[PDB]
Protein: TbpB
Amino acid sequence: TVLDAVELTLNDKKIKNLDNFSNAAQLVVDGIMIDLAEFTRKFEHTINGKTYEVEVCCSNLNYLKYGMLTRKGKQVEQSMFLQGERTDEKEIPTDQNVVYRGSWYGHIANGTSWSGNASDKEGGNRAEFTVNFADKKITGKLTAENRQAQTFTIEGMIQGNGFEGTAKTAESGFDLDQKNTRTPKAYITDAKVKGGFYGPKAEELGGWFAYHKSDNGSATVVFGAKRQQP
Structure:
């Protein structure tokens, strides 16, 4: 409290608020509780007869967890989730040039689809943000696994312990495949980003978006990052 807790469903690109126990490490889905306790961890859990597959990040985050939730049985449904305990508004820094580094899970489509899971490796899904608290501005970029150019450009404004803004692909679109010839591209010109700063003194930040547009493409993303030393 206050606690962001969201699930993003991949099939219909929707965002739902989850019930919670004021605990980022406790995922409360379908009335039951899953403990999210190197970098990422992957596991299965059955409770009440229901089987869940969970991939969660990150070992180095203490106030924020994000990842993939797969409900299996008769129907395999895929979701992303993010949970974080917001930093008290009075504890929000006023510094400029604060760098946060982390990763993201993404699913991007337009006809055909691309997906990528969080990573702490060079060449993996990576996220980087620069927060200018005094300007109340956050900017950042998400880069897809095994891609040279950044994938999403993020810009937002900070209000209290949260931020909101936009995520967009390159103007020429995101190549869904690296086999180029004609290659399918996704164009995300206007995705609405929502996020927060988590933990004491905003040591962590995270956010999410779920976007779809005809003739352009769709994207479902959760990301998280940790404040870096100078």
About this structure: The chain is about 0% helix and 60% strand. The chain has two domains: 1-86, 87-230. The two ends are 30 Å apart (CA to CA).
